[PDB]
Amino acid sequence: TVTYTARVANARFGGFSQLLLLWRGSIYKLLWRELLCFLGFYMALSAAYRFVLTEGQKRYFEKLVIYCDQYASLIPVSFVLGFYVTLVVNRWWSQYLCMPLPDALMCVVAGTVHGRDDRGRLYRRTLMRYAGLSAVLILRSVSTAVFKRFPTIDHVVEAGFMTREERKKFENLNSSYNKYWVPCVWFSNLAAQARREGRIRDNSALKLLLEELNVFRGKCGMLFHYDWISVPLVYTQVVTIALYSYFLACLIGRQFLDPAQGYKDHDLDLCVPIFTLLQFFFYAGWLKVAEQLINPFGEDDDDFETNFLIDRNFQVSMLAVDEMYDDLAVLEKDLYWDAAEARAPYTAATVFQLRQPSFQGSTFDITLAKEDMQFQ
Amino acid sequence: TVTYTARVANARFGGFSQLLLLWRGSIYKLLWRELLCFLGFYMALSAAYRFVLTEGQKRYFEKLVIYCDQYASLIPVSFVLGFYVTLVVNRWWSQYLCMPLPDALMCVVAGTVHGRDDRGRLYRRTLMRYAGLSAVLILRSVSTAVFKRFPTIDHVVEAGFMTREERKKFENLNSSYNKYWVPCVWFSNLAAQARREGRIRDNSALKLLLEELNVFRGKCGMLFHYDWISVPLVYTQVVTIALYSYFLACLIGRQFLDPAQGYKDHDLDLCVPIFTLLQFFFYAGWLKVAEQLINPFGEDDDDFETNFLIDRNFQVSMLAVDEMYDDLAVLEKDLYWDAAEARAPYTAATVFQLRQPSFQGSTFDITLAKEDMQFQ
Amino acid sequence: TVTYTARVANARFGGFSQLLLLWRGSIYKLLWRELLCFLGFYMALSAAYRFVLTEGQKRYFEKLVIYCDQYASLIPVSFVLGFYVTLVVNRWWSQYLCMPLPDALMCVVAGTVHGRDDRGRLYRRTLMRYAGLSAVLILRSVSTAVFKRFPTIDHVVEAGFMTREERKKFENLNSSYNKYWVPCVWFSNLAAQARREGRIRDNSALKLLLEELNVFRGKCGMLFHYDWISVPLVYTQVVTIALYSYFLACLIGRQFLDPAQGYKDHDLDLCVPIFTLLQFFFYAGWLKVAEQLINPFGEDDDDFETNFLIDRNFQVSMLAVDEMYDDLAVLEKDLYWDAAEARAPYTAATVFQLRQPSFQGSTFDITLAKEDMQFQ
Amino acid sequence: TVTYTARVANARFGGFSQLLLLWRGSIYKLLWRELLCFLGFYMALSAAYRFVLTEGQKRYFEKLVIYCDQYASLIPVSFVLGFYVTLVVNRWWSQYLCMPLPDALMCVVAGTVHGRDDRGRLYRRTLMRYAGLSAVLILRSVSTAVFKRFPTIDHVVEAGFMTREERKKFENLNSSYNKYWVPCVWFSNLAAQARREGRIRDNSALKLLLEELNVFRGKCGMLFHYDWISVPLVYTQVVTIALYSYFLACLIGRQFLDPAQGYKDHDLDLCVPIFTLLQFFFYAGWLKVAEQLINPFGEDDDDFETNFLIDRNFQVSMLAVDEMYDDLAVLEKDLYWDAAEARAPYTAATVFQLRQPSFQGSTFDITLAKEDMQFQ
Amino acid sequence: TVTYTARVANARFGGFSQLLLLWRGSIYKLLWRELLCFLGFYMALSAAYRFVLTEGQKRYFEKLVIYCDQYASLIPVSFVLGFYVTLVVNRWWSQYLCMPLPDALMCVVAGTVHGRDDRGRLYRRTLMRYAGLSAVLILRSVSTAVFKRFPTIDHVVEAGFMTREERKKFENLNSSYNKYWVPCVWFSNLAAQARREGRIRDNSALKLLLEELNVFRGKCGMLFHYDWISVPLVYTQVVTIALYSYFLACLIGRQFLDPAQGYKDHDLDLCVPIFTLLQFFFYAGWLKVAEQLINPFGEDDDDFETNFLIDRNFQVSMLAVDEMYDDLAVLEKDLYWDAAEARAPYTAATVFQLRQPSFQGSTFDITLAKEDMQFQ
Ligand SMILES: [Ca+2]
Ligand SMILES: [Ca+2]
Ligand SMILES: [Ca+2]
Ligand SMILES: [Ca+2]
Ligand SMILES: [Ca+2]
Ligand SMILES: [Cl-]
């Protein structure tokens, strides 16, 4: 993930122009090799036309350039790229939202699984660890970074997500299918056991835990589904073929011809196709948007920071359900106890935000006449 | 936020034309500097062509202008801008909907956390304050205005959202990750304690509170996610490059050439490219839509009024759970107690809305024949 | 709201052509003034060119017309209008869906708040009235029609939505922010009181009421949010400027020039720009779609009938929770008690719908071979 | 509804070409009259030009044809049709999803409303019948087919959905608004009564029934909303005007002119405008998509089969809650009781689907090196 | 399903170019027959023009080619294909998400339906089997692969999803409509019976089971709805006609004419229309995207692997509710019990992901001045 939110807080004169100076996660880093290849092919053709071809060969080359320039139809490739890239971007955001987060479960577990003794701590920590373990098993299945961090289940055990006894039970299960779901079943069984032992004090609490477990588990399953059901290969091939067809038509049709021949719209030889290179950057970068986002669990600069999320989720979940269990500051009167109204102070830098009228609704400046307001 | 809803209540002859006279949050305020820069570059080129260049240099300049005018392809930039700006606008609205609001929690707390004594007031106020505190911690993390108002946790304490004892516990937590979630865990623990003490009278009430806490907390988390996962930098760079490429092609290709040379479509010298300036305003403003909306938590005119929302939310939540707790007007018979039907009166200005038929459904004017209506 | 659903039940030969004959909520009613203004400007220019200008002035005018006709680029304005109008239409439907309806609450209240005595009737009627009152307070804040009907809180009291004692409590609340939410807090308190008194017989019933109260209250809040957060002014200005730029280019470039001058594509003088007028109707009407829908709570023909909805909602809610409480027809055997199957009769006009095969699924005509169906 | 799912199970060489041979619900059936009218107007103009007009009149006609052919701008009409038709299609699917189905309620009622005696059967059947009755009342309000089947409430009574006593109560209710919601209030009251009598054994069961009742009732309400709030008439008029403007420009500008006059791009007289007729079919059919779908509750071939759904829903709901109540096959061990794993057999026709590797995740072929996998 | 997620983990120099080398689920496999047919027709016309036609016939053929090349309007077909294919792709993903999965139910059943004895195992296995059976009945109704695997209900019985006694009850039900829903009613009855016998220990548990049953059943129903309500046939016909019209215009208008005739833009005879073939591949493949996805339950390479999902779902559900019931590893202290913080180790290949700063929010680099931060 390349975060530039702070740079674009305000619409400024520099605006996105300053974003054009960034390298990490940039169009430049993704496209410079393809740009050099396109320029190399173009300049090889230009050099052959200028120095190698005979007069007859040059005349035929000019006819082919004029013919090919007709098929450089940008409007259709723009259509398909717009639709396809928008599909990939929407799917990318949907995939991010399917990342399993323990926050809802950790709040419910902290509020529902009780006891300051070691057994209560074991119940809470084990429930949150099962959630973390499911997340790790699915992520190592779908994320190259996570897999490289956990290339075998032995690494999951050594990392503390799974115990050796848990690993014995996990491997003894006869299944040819991915077992990311197993810790969710463990969670359900352990929650039922906690309710049976009175650690969960009510049936409604157990229902809430199971409701939140299924939300978490469904997010894990959604990651599996996105990983399995690629964007249809035919669609990806269609868009790639359209883009490369346009690039072929430009590579031939955008050649600078001898101005002496006096061909229509060929009277200037700049020797470098500046606007064609800008068009190539535009269109190829537009497709590179999809190329980077189509699998966001790789190691691209703008791919999701899955290992960071595993670490954050585990650390925060353990804090919430172990260190913060029943550890409230004493109930005390707040600063605004004696004030019927309340408003926090403003800094010198933000007090200007005051004196903007408190919006009440769009209708409170109509100012009707007396006779109009009387009920029938 | 620049609210103009009242101005556009009706489709009028003036309509959006009157909106063209607004300055705050306007295209003009966002784009006048870029418009002056574009006009300056254009007029510098025009002045060099008219007064500096020699005849040969002028002929070459005319060839370059004619060549460059071919690549001013507006249709592709329109495509990419449409798709990209629509993505940014949808994301902007989604981000607004993720703003944490205490209204659902304040209704549930007012209805479920009981006692007119000081301890009941402490429970209700502390629960709502925890919600407000989570909102402040995330907003100061994602909003420049809120951060400038709360540049340190000391400011949060002095503003009354967090207590000194709460601050001690908050800082003692060993976490390298953002702690906006901590008050939600405090809320869960305090709700469990209130249920244990009988302040919350039923398990279903506690479940409802925890359900609403997780909705609120999820909105906080969503703000964090939007702040972290920028719109992919490559996509922003692609659209910016497309727009600036079109601007380069226009800056060269829209130059007024000497009509004496008799170039095709160059026979009028207006000395000011009026339609190119209007196109620049159109396209650059279209992108400025995204530039303003890409981070709605800045200090732009149309950015969200986050400090106003913090103040409103805190004040209303405290009113709802403290002043309005168990403070009902006595149950009394309403004006329409003795009327089988009921309808409120209309004013002289609105009685015309009556005599419009009460819509019953689209099918109640078919008026079939007698023989058609008989069951088989 | 202009309902034409009945006219378009079937795709007919007349089809939408007949819709072109409608006036209420029509393109004609919204655009005839702008059409006359455009035609007036066009004909003023035409008259000046034909009768006022000298020969030299006419030649310069012809050059300006030919120059301006080049910038009448409809493809870009089509893009921006498509994206912007689609955004406004989607937002319009979303706003309609945020209209608070008491139906869910009235069903729950009728089923959960018990007693045929006056006190039960008071509880049920007061709960539904609180819902209605919240809807009225928000609608009068966001709707010009509703505001004109309830220009002051005194009108809300005289209309029966709020009692005088309720008004005393309502005004005594020290809040600078809109108080539409207050009756929802009253509802929560009154539901808690009803549960405490045994009028609500179970905790799950109270939870259901509070769950439905928050859905209703959230819809009220959503109306406030839509009213406050306009479609970004910059975007509206951009689309308006694009449309008016195209109109300027057409007003100059579509002038009929003297055919004697023999300009390319200027050999016919129809004296009335029929196709330009049709294009103006098309594009200006396309934008008028957004102009009408951007604020659907005004007094346009196709704006929402908010006063009708207030009346319907109040009347139906009171019927449901008061007249229909515990007023069931005696449980009796239905017409199909003794029939294992069942099907209602068809009329002579609809019996043709029978003899269409009952769809079972797409796979039930594959008709595989014997050898293929045997399990391995 | 015209179901062709079976014909398009696989992408085949014939593919959609075979779909071009279908008549029911076809473009041909919807558009042949308009195609004949367009061809008649075109051929009338052609005949007048070829046989009636004088030489001078023919020269003026040629100038008008050349002028009109310039305004046949397909790109703008394509834009507006794309956006508008996509809106109508999305709304069409949304409306289908709002069709009230009793399946969720019938499962809950079968599982929660108890007793094999006549009184239990009466409770279950009456609850499901109330759901069916609400569906019939709304559908007869919004569907021409259903209305023709139930043109009066007397038909609803004779069909068995409503009883005579129920009809007395239904008509005695003083409401000027549609009463489709009344049976939902009856359902709520009857569910409360069943809980009070112990037929519903728990408060959570009653809550579940009321939760599912409100989902069903909300779908009924959504049908009412879609029926009432048409797609804005101005938008429909705008798209229709754009299409008909293009058709006018084609009807004049696509006339075959005398090749002898040697007009540019007029050298071939085919006497039948084949490509213009194909364009008319394309664009007019594109709009006919919306014309058919804008009200899906009519009697078009592809309109929803509402009467079939009423019959299916009633029959299945009665089966589920009456014949299938507490009628389980005895709990017996399944075929895979003694198998730790399990997999159903494959047929000779489907066994080829085996030997495709069981997908485990995208990361399980990375095959890292030994040194890379060691924890830090 | 053709999964290529692993190939596109990173945006690479090869990128989608390497995807152009794939055959299974490729554009090539779907389109080579149509490409050969188009090329055959084109070359037949070319051969007739070059070798069969007389001089007069060749001149007329040249006029027809020039005339037809004018109507090869790609911009409109691009529009309709974009909108239509996007609709089909969104519907395809929606259909995938409606595939019934037992995971949520298996977690709830494992946690709520109790007993290590044979009767508990029978309850859990039978509930999960009912879910699997409903999925099989709907899938065999909508999926050609599943139907070929289960061409009769006898195959469902022999496969173990349905028992012989269950089959007797199933066939005795008098219904002309699809019975996929029957096992869901069986599930509801059996869950009620388990609650009555005390196997389900609480009312909230039973509610949770019924809530998850209805989610599962609704997904089954959604598959039925998608199977029944095809994408409107008129829309499919419109897009197909537009594409084939463009193909006709290209087949005639893209013919290579004799360069000697000196027609404008006809001076090169390549004898093979390379760019027209690439355009045909682009557009025909774009439509083949929809052709494959319109019914994803067929036997295309990229159609859903429904039989694999049936096998996986059944096997995993049985494991979860039978082998894993109350089979927890003993509660033991985790690796991070004594650590206030926690972080799993990194491998040599992934440790580089560390030293990237832990994102705290976009506002934590503003660095305001001292005087600005002071509260008013
Ligand atoms: Ca990637
Ligand atoms: Ca901003
Ligand atoms: Ca309006
Ligand atoms: Ca219809
Ligand atoms: Ca298929
Ligand atoms: Cl619940």
Author numbering:
A (entry chain C), B (entry chain D), C (entry chain E), D (entry chain A), E (entry chain B): 2 to 377
Task: Show passages lifted from the paper.
The bestrophins are a family of Ca2+-activated anion channels consisting of four members (Best1–4) in mammals.
Under both 1 μM and 5 mM Ca2+ conditions, most of the hBest1/hBest2 particles (~90–95%) were in a Ca2+-bound closed state, which is very similar to the Ca2+-unbound closed state. By comparing Ca2+-bound hBest2 in the closed and open states, we defined the structural changes coordinated with neck gating at residues 346–379. Therefore, the binding of residues 346–379 to the channel periphery provides an inter-protomer cooperative mechanism to constrict the channel concentrically. As S205 is conserved in most mammalian Best2 homologs and Best2 is reported to conduct HCO3− 21, the dual conformation of S205 may affect the flow of larger anions.
